[PDB]
Structure formats: structure tokens, C-alpha cells
RNA sequence: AGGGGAUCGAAGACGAUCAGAUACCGUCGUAGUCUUAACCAUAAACUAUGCCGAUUAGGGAUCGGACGGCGUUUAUUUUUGACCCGUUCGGCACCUUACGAUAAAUCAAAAUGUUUGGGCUCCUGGGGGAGUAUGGUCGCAAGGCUGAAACUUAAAGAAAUUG
């Protein structure tokens, strides 16, 4: 409720406003382990849960009863995540796969369909993503076409930013977590494909944390 | 499923092997397939050693030792505890027990 | 020499103390990338480490040490007790945190263990001996530095010296000139030439 | 990076493996950087003056990374006469 | 008759804490507990003087893992800064010549690097 | 038996790439390994190459700078009209930006984008991105 | 069967927010 | 169809066991088990993994051939042979590892496949009915190869987790 104590050093960095964005962190891969620096950056971040579904554990009295939910976040501006818990109870379970889902957003990278004419709208190429027997592969598409896909990766790509794209499944899609980590797998990628634009020489700079002096 | 990777057989490189009788029960098992194992013991229990030994006409004496070789179908070796069932990952060990050189 | 001078040498001394405390000594079996730290294989023996690139990566490890903003963010390792004393006086002559003896993994991962830590680099006596504290490592960004002998895994591990890494003499002994050349770089010892008033005895180990 | 009528759309440019050129991926736990002081011609040691190397995770995991720094170093005039190719 | 951790932990932090004000009679450390701590039952006071008492037995007869007091403590690092005053790796002063004993194939690396001065005894190595 | 050499030399090249390494060596050469080798060459996406002469059909040793993700053949060499070129593009190209698609034609091999300036057709060989 | 706590939650969103006649 | 017929032993005859025991256990015992001259063509005929070619990672053992080397052993003795160290070509296997692959167990191939094309042959399409009916063909016979339909059903099955 009331003011947090950072506890790791980044964290304090960011409470004294150190850092600029979000991006600084990802350019030099450094881990989060508190969700009070993601919202600090990043507000307006919107949540909606999935579904949930009970498991079951066989015990000699009789039978134990967990729940576990799905949950997925995004700005619909090129930041997305989802995380998964499970828990003796429904309302703790949500609470908890919430924090998860915001350790985990990811920016994605959105191009252009042939000619350029700002704000890009759709994947800048094709990339797929397998994640237990799903596979989800991923088309760029022309300007003007909606998104063609089942209603639960419509969802996942509609809080991406990303707005054109064409859609391919395999394998038993029925298994909801599987797909959507397949699909968060596929738009995680993106930045991974080394197009002909990136090939001019970066400067390496050293990181926030060793060019900074933390509080006591 | 394969419970061993060798088939709990070891026979790889050729087709057939001549079967062998069993010590026990008198079956019938390939001879790679049995429990082999090699005693080595003395004619007389180490109590009785004495008693020959004194009563004996050859000044110091020593008793002569018998040699066998018992082997086995698998189903009268675990009957006999001659080795008996491990767990998944200790499968994998071949290599022979450490006896007891100490015997507390 | 577009970035190092010719005043980094051996010197004659230097080399005097490492074969004189069997740093040289290699064991039988050859890590294949090990080979380029290799002399010559002894006839009917052990192979052989090639002392001058002994010197030229210790130097070059050292230097990576004084780019640390505070010292406070080295951490060196050592599990095995040849190691242990060595590492304890290089954490007092220097800025340094030590760990001696058990590790209690998930001392890096961990946020709410008792030995809870967040370095910048890491210093390893022996890879295998310490591949906890080399696995913590690849989680969480940290470059890795290690003392190796002929044979060892490389996995994660950067600057690799090559030593015996298993003698009573030769671990104290690296440890002792690495801590020297750290004060050297600083303006601590101030020049190449003057000679240091710490014996190298004192980084070595006692039976009780 | 893209452009649409000169300027620049892309969220932020990643930066490239020293040793083989791949992109270093956000959350690709593993990849370090390396700083190397510069020394004077004395032999002590400049503040704020270093050369910066960066290493991918996969590359590390292989194993290689010693040699790929062997290799580096030496190009940039920091070592003598311990990497060559056979 | 085996003592619990509630005994076992609570006779570590009076030791260690106030090591010579009790002794090796179990009468003493009796009225020593009592005052210096806060214990509900006279026999749990009864048990933790019975362990803490014995502890010391032991301890009489070098050092026991797990148990430090300042007086052990400080004797210690009074011990690390042991140094003799000739080095073992010096060699000089050591043997009957201060030339040491290698290998063939190691004088070539010297001679490699170019340290040919140094005073050496090379001897031969095989066995095959 | 060996049935393209075409395809040993675009499989080892892919396989030594994608494991991080620099350099390559080809067993058997040919004219349309070289002649394929130096449309990727003037494209940036390899660097030098070299020829050594034995007297059977020499070897080659080809130096990666990266930047290269795949390289692959179609061994049915079909039969593609200048119309129905941008069929194969759709299938086998990432994206419509960069890309190339090998063509062999009367008038030497080229990659689909310069057969199109000169109006020109004929069998699909590779490709490469 | 987690379908109890759906009237009164208001701390999440649901997929297909159920319409009341 | 002849020769041979020690030992084991389908069928068969008895003794026990059992509520029953046409079985497990025990004593006998025919065809068969072996060989010469002709038929039969099926096996969990198994690595449940077709054949040719290229590339991809570390390690130590072993069988066959060649090449290099310090010694020991030994002979009408040298060169050879036995043992020791290293390199290399061709084999039956094994240990570690995952950058990779798979639903998983696990795999140096079951890898180089949604970023999908090196060449070639055979086989499979929910579970039963059914490898059955019928026609043809091969065989002295037992049988082999080829091989349906009517009708019926919402589940059979694989790998792993807790009881
Ligand atoms: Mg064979
Ligand atoms: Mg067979
Ligand atoms: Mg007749
Ligand atoms: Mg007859
Ligand atoms: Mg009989
Ligand atoms: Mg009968
Ligand atoms: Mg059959
Ligand atoms: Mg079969
Ligand atoms: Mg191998
Ligand atoms: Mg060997
Ligand atoms: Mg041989
Ligand atoms: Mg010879
Ligand atoms: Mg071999
Ligand atoms: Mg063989
Ligand atoms: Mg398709
Ligand atoms: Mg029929
Ligand atoms: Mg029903
Ligand atoms: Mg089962
Ligand atoms: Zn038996």
C-alpha cells in the first residue's frame, strides 16, 4: 500500500530516477525481479484474465482440489506477458499470476507490408514458435486486412500492437496454455531475426549498474 | 517401453547362442542371458580344520579347495537372493559390489 | 604494443618463484581447448603449461579488476581448503568479499537469503570443484574468471590462467601476484620496480 | 533500424555478439560484457578510459569464449604472441 | 534421553555469549542461567544448565565445530599472521647448491622465453 | 551416390554458420558452385573465397562474416515462366524487402530480381537469405 | 467450477464478460 | 521313403495333491530327437529402427592390417615373435553432454523440417466383424500367398504423475 524499500540495486536506481526507460534495461538484458519498477515505467498496463481450470491430486482420504489460472497483459503499444499460478484458492491465484505476468513483458518489433508510410503495422518478417506439439507461425500482411485468428492468440496479438497479420496452427490447439506460450514465443523472437537494416556497427557502452553509485 | 538398453541380454554382434541348463530348476536360457557366479571354498567348515589337522600323519598339513561355477535363469536368481531389485537410476551400474574388507 | 608498454615483462624474479612452486606441472589428461596452453607432453608423462602465457593472462585479468568502480563488487570463490586462507587475505590487502568453504546455493538467484549477493565479477580457484557458484552465474549476467589446469570444463568461464591449480605452493602463490598487480595498476605500490613488504608465505596454508 | 521518411520507428537497436555478430536478445540471461582498463605510459591505470567486449550466451555455453577473447584482444594490440591460428 | 533443539539452541547463545562468568560445576552454572536469562519452568532451567555444563567438558579439550566465543575467536586470526623468515619457494639458501633440479623439455622453454641465465640442474626423464 | 554436388556445398556451408564458425571447406567444385557463390559474394553476404588445384576437381575454402541465415536448393529443377515468378517468392522468401531467388537462364544465372529487369526466365536452382 | 465469486470480483477481466438479461 | 534308435520325451498308463485336478509334483513310456535322398516357406525370423551419399562434439577401452620409437625378455639368438608409448584406415560396442529433436520414455541419430525439396523401393488411415466368407493360384497333406461385404459402436490405444 504505502511506499516500497527497494531491495535489489536496480530497483534503487530506479526509485531515484536514474535510468530513462524501460529500454535502457533491455538493451543491456538485465533481469527483473520487482514489479514495482515495470508499472513505474510502463502505466496504463491492462489485464484480463483467461480462464481457470481445477486440477486434481489423488490422496488417500480422498481427493485435492487446486486452481490455477491464466493470465496475460499488455499495452497494445508493443509491450505484452503473460504468466501462470496455481493456488489453493481462486481469488489468490489471480492476484498472484497478475504479478507474474509483469516480471515477464517483452517489447516486440513491428515493420512495414512493401512500401513504408509510418507508423508500421504489421511483423516485419514470418516467425513461428513451437511449445509441446503447438506450432504457431505468423505472416505479414498487407494494410487494410483485420486480424485472421482463433479468438484466444487474437487476443494475445491485439495487446501487442501488432494490427495485420495472417495466422497458421498445428498439432492439438485445444491445450489453451500451450498455445499462448507458443504464440509468446513466435512475437518474442522478433527482435531476434538480424534483417540487411541491422548490420551497421553499434558503440558498446557501459552499464547503468557499474557506472553508478548505489545508496547505502 | 524398453526397461534396459541392452535388453538385459548382451548379445550384439551376432544372431544365435547356444542355450545352457539352469543349476536349479534345469531350464533352458542363453548363456549370456544367466547369472554366472565363481566360488572358491575350502573342503571342510573352518570349525572342522582342527580336528583334521591334528589327526592327520603329514606333519602340517593343508586342506585342498573345491572350485564351481553355479549360473542361473533369472527367475531362480532373485528367488535365492542371489541379487535381488534395484532402483531406476541404480539399474545402470555395472560395476561388482565392494566387499566388505573390514568386517567391522 | 598499442596498448600495453614494455615495462609488463616477466622479469627474471618473477618467473624465478613460479617454477620454483611447480606451476608448470600439468596433469596427464588434455582438455582439447587447453591445447594452446601447452609447451611440450612430457616423455612418458604429463604435459607441460607454457609459462609465458601464464604471465601475459594474469596481467590481462588483473586489468579487468581495476575497472570496477568499487572493489566491494568482487567476490572470489574457494571451496577446497588450499584455496581457503589465499582468498581471505586477498579479500582484507584488497577491496573484496570472500566465500570459504560451503557455498549455500542460491546465494546469487535468492533475494531473501542470509548471504545474499550482487557482484560484478566473479573469481573461481578451481571450475570444477566450483560449478555452483560458475551455474548461479549464467542466470544472472556476471563474466567469470577462473585459475585452470590442463584439464577442466570451460563452460562460462572467459579468462582462464593456466596453473597446477592443485598444488600446496602454486594456488597461493597466483593468488599472491594477482593481488600484487591490482595494487599496482592503483597507485598503492606506485612503481614497477620496489618490491613489496608482504611475504608470499602468507598466502599459503596450515594443517590445524 | 527503419525508416518511413528518414527517421527512425524502431523501439530500441539491440546490440551484436563480438565473436560471431548474432543479435543479443532481450531476457538472453548469460551475455555479459567485458571492460578493459587502459594504462598509461608509467603503468598506472586511467580512470575512464576502456575497451568494451560483448559475449552472446550462446557462445559461452559452447565453451569458447576464452578463445574468442584471445583472438580479440590480441587484434586490439593488448596481448603478444598467445593467439594464432595453426 | 535425547535433548530437543529448544535445549540445544538456547545452551549455544549462552555460551558463546557469556563464556567465563560459568564453569565446568554443574551447581554454579545453575545460578548462573537463572539470572541471565528468562525461563518459565525450573525444569526446562534444569536441562538447558545440564547441556551447557557438559558442552564445556569437551571444549576443555580442543575446540568443537559450531561453537565460537571471543576468546577463541580473537586467539585465532592471532595465529594467521604466522610467517617464517626464509621462504620455502626461495631456493638459495635452501640445498646444498642453490641451483634446483627440472626437466630437459622445461629448459627449452626457458631458453624459449629467454631466461638462459637462470642456474639450473636438468635431468633426463623416461620410462616407457 | 553423389547426386548434387550443389546441395553438399549449400548443406555445409549452413551447417557451419549455424554453429558460429568462419570458415568452410568444399570437396568438389564446380562451375555452378562458383557461379553461385558469386551472386551471394556481391550481395555482402560472404566474404573471399579461394580455389585450391588438385588435378582431380580441386577444393574450396569459403571465410563467413555472419550475417547469412539460410541457403537452400529445390532439386526438382522446374520449370518457371517470367509470369509465375512471383509465386515462388510468396513461398520461400521471409519478406518481400530482401530476399533472393536463384534463376538459371540462357543468359547465365542470375537472382529474381535482376531477371526481371532484363525480362528473362527459365529453371529455379536456390536460394538464400 | 470456479463460477461462485464472479458476480462481485471487479479486481479482474474476464474473456467473455457474461451479459446480464 | 531307407538306415539308426544311448539319452530326453507330445499321445498314453499308473501314484499322490485337491471340494473337483483330464494340470503343476513323481515312476514308466510311443511318434519325435540323429543321418542319407526329396517336400514344406512360416517365427517376438527384433536393433519391434529399409538401402546409397554428405555434413555436425568431447572421451577412454577393444579386434584386424600398416607406419614411427626408448628399453626389457629371449632363442645357433640378429631381422622377426611377446610386452610398453604414439599416429592412422576399417569394424562389434560403450561413457559424458544438449547447441539440436520428440507427447514422453529416451536418441551421435530418432539431429541438420512452418527458415518445410540430395536419389530410390515397400507399408499405414478410429475400434470391432476379420486375416474370417468367397474366387484364383502353389503343396502328397498340414497349410502358404492374394483378400472382401452386410452389420455394430464413442471410444479403444501410447508415455508419464499422485494414490
Ligand atoms: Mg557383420
Ligand atoms: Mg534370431
Ligand atoms: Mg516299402
Ligand atoms: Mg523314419
Ligand atoms: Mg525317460
Ligand atoms: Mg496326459
Ligand atoms: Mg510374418
Ligand atoms: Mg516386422
Ligand atoms: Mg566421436
Ligand atoms: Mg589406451
Ligand atoms: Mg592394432
Ligand atoms: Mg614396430
Ligand atoms: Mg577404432
Ligand atoms: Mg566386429
Ligand atoms: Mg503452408
Ligand atoms: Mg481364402
Ligand atoms: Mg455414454
Ligand atoms: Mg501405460
Ligand atoms: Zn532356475
Avoid at chain 5, 112 to 128: A, E, R, W, Y
Wanted: glycine residues 6%.
Amino acid at each position: 500500500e504505502k511506499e516500497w524499500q527497494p531491495v535489489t540495486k536496480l530497483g534503487r536506481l530506479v526509485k531515484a530516477g536514474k535510468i530513462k526507460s524501460m529500454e535502457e534495461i533491455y538493451l543491456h538484458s538485465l533481469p527483473i525481479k520487482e514489479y514495482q519498477i515495470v508499472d513505474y515505467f510502463l502505466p496504463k498496463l491492462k489485464d484480463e484474465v483467461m480462464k481457470i481450470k481445477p486440477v486434481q491430486k489423488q490422496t488417500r482420504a480422498g481427493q485435492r482440489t487446486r486452481f490455477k489460472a491464466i493470465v496475460l497483459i499488455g499495452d497494445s503499444d508493443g509491450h505484452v506477458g503473460l504468466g501462470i499460478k496455481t493456488s489453493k484458492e481462486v481469488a489468490t491465484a489471480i492476484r498472484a499470476a497478475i504479478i507474474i505476468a509483469k516480471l515477464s513483458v517483452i517489447p516486440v518489433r513491428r515493420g512495414y507490408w512493401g512500401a513504408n508510410l509510418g507508423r508500421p503495422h504489421s511483423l516485419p518478417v514470418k516467425q513461428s514458435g513451437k511449445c509441446g506439439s503447438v506450432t504457431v507461425r505468423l505472416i505479414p500482411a498487407p494494410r487494410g486486412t483485420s486480424l485472421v485468428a482463433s479468438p484466444a492468440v487474437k487476443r494475445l496479438l491485439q495487446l501487442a500492437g501488432i494490427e495485420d497479420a495472417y495466422t497458421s496452427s498445428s498439432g492439438s490447439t485445444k491445450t489453451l496454455e500451450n498455445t499462448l506460450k507458443a504464440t509468446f514465443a513466435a512475437v518474442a523472437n522478433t527482435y531476434g531475426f538480424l534483417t540487411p537494416n541491422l548490420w551497421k556497427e553499434t558503440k558498446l557502452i557501459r552499464s547503468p549498474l557499474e557506472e553508478y553509485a548505489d545508496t547505502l | 517401453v524398453k526397461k534396459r538398453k541392452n535388453n538385459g541380454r548382451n548379445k550384439k554382434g551376432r544372431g544365435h547362442v547356444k542355450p545352457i541348463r539352469c543349476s536349479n530348476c534345469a531350464r533352458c536360457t542363453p548363456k549370456d542371458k544367466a547369472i554366472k557366479r565363481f566360488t572358491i571354498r575350502n573342503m571342510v567348515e573352518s570349525a572342522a580344520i582342527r580336528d583334521i589337522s591334528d589327526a592327520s600323519v603329514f606333519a602340517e598339513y593343508t586342506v585342498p579347495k573345491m572350485y564351481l561355477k553355479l549360473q542361473y535363469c533369472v527367475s531362480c536368481a532373485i528367488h535365492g537372493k542371489i541379487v535381488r531389485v534395484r532402483s531406476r537410476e541404480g539399474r545402470r551400474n555395472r560395476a561388482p559390489p565392494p566387499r566388505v574388507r573390514y568386517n567391522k | 604494443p598499442a596498448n600495453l608498454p614494455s615495462i609488463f615483462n616477466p622479469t627474471s624474479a618473477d618467473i624465478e618463484q613460479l617454477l620454483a612452486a611447480q606451476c608448470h606441472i600439468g596433469s596427464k589428461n588434455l582438455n582439447v581447448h587447453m591445447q594452446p596452453y601447452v609447451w611440450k607432453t612430457r616423455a612418458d608423462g604429463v604435459n607441460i603449461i607454457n609459462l609465458g602465457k601464464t604471465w601475459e593472462k594474469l596481467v590481462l585479468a588483473a586489468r579487468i579488476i581495476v575497472a570496477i568502480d568499487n572493489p566491494s563488487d568482487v567476490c572470489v570463490i574457494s571451496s577446497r581448503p588450499f584455496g581457503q586462507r589465499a582468498v581471505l587475505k586477498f579479500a582484507a590487502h584488497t577491496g573484496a568479499q570472500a566465500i570459504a568453504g560451503r557455498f549455500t546455493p542460491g546465494s546469487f538467484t535468492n533475494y531473501i537469503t542470509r548471504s545474499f549477493k550482487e557482484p560484478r565479477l566473479i573469481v573461481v580457484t578451481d571450475p570444477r570443484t566450483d560449478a555452483q557458484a560458475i551455474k548461479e552465474a549464467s542466470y544472472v549476467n556476471i563474466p567469470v574468471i577462473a585459475l585452470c589446469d590442463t584439464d577442466s570444463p570451460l563452460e562460462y568461464v572467459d579468462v582462464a590462467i593456466p596453473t597446477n591449480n592443485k598444488g600446496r605452493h602454486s594456488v597461493g602463490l597466483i593468488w599472491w601476484m594477482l593481488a600484487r598487480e591490482v595494487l599496482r595498476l592503483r597507485g598503492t605500490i606506485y612503481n614497477r620496480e620496489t618490491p613489496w613488504d608482504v611475504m608470499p608465505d602468507l598466502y599459503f596454508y596450515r594443517d590445524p | 533500424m527503419e525508416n518511413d521518411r528518414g527517421e527512425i520507428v524502431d523501439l530500441y537497436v539491440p546490440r551484436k555478439c563480438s565473436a560471431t555478430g548474432r543479435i543479443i536478445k532481450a531476457k538472453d540471461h548469460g551475455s555479459c560484457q567485458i571492460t578493459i582498463a587502459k594504462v598509461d605510459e608509467n603503468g598506472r591505470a586511467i580512470q575512464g578510459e576502456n575497451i568494451i567486449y560483448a559475449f552472446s550466451g550462446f557462445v559461452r555455453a559452447m565453451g569458447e569464449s576464452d578463445d574468442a577473447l584471445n583472438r580479440l584482444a590480441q587484434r586490439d594490440g593488448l596481448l603478444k604472441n598467445v593467439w594464432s591460428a595453426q | 534421553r535425547v535433548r530437543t533443539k529448544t535445549v540445544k539452541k538456547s545452551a549455544k547463545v549462552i555460551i558463546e555469549k557469556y563464556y567465563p562468568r560459568l564453569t565446568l560445576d554443574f551447581e554454579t552454572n545453575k545460578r548462573v542461567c537463572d539470572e541471565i536469562a528468562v525461563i518459565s519452568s525450573k525444569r526446562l532451567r534444569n536441562k538447558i544448565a545440564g547441556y551447557t555444563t557438559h558442552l564445556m567438558k569437551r571444549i576443555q579439550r580442543g575446540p568443537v565445530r559450531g561453537i565460537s566465543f571471543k576468546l577463541q575467536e580473537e586467539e585465532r586470526e592471532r595465529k594467521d599472521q604466522y610467517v617464517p623468515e626464509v621462504s620455502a619457494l626461495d631456493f638459495h639458501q635452501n640445498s646444498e647448491t642453490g641451483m634446483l633440479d627440472i626437466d630437459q623439455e622445461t629448459k627449452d622453454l626457458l631458453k624459449h622465453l629467454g631466461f638462459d641465465s637462470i642456474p639450473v640442474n636438468v635431468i633426463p626423464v623416461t620410462q616407457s | 551416390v553423389r547426386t548434387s554436388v550443389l546441395h553438399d556445398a549449400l548443406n555445409s556451408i549452413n551447417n557451419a554458420e549455424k554453429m558460429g564458425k568462419r570458415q568452410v571447406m568444399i570437396r568438389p567444385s564446380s562451375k555452378v558452385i562458383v557461379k553461385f557463390l558469386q551472386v551471394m559474394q556481391r550481395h555482402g553476404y560472404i566474404g573471399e573465397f579461394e580455389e585450391v588445384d588438385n588435378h582431380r576437381s580441386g577444393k574450396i575454402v569459403v571465410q563467413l562474416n555472419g550475417r547469412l541465415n539460410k541457403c537452400g536448393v529445390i532439386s526438382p529443377r522446374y520449370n518457371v515462366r517470367l509470369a509465375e515468378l512471383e509465386k515462388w517468392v510468396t513461398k520461400l522468401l521471409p519478406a518481400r524487402q530482401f530476399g533472393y531467388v536463384i534463376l538459371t537462364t540462357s543468359a547465365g544465372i542470375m537472382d529474381h530480381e535482376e531477371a526481371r529487369r532484363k525480362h528473362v526466365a527459365g529453371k529455379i536452382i536456390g536460394f538464400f537469405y | 467450477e470456479g463460477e461462485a465469486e464472479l458476480k462481485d470480483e471487479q479486481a479482474a477481466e474476464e474473456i467473455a464478460q457474461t451479459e446480464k438479461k
